[PDB]
């Protein structure tokens, strides 16, 4: 039963890892959608302004 | 009676040699077309289960 604990240890990390990436994939989503969206306000304030 | 002869209304662009500066804003085309992952997301997670 020695080899239990570094089995936990490593699943937990695997475990933060795999949130990690999840929560960045999410956080580059977010920035995707806002920056698509300022863009086309922008550029739809500037043809107007023009 | 003195004459109107040195008002002259200045204009913005009358004749600057035809510019004709060609911006070709191409904002819309800036659009960040993010690849997906590589699977394991529909698939996997209805074939594990429990
Ligand atoms: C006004 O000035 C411009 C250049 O300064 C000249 O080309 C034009 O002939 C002038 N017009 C009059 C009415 O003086």
């Given at each position: 039963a020695l080899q239990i604990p570094f089995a936990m240890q490593m699943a937990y990390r695997f475990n933060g890892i795999g949130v990690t990436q999840n929560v960045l994939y999410e956080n580059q989503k977010l920035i995707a959608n806002q920056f698509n969206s300022a863009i086309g306000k922008i550029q739809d304030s500037l043809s107007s302004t023009a | 009676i003195k004459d109107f002869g040195g008002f002259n209304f200045s204009?913005?662009?009358?004749?600057?040699?035809?510019?004709?500066?060609?911006?070709?804003?191409?904002?819309?085309?800036?659009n960040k077309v993010t690849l997906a992952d590589a699977?394991?997301?529909?698939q996997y997670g209805d074939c594990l289960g429990d």
């Open positions: - | 204009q913005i662009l009358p004749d600057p040699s035809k510019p004709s500066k060609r911006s070709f804003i191409e904002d819309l085309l800036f699977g394991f997301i529909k």
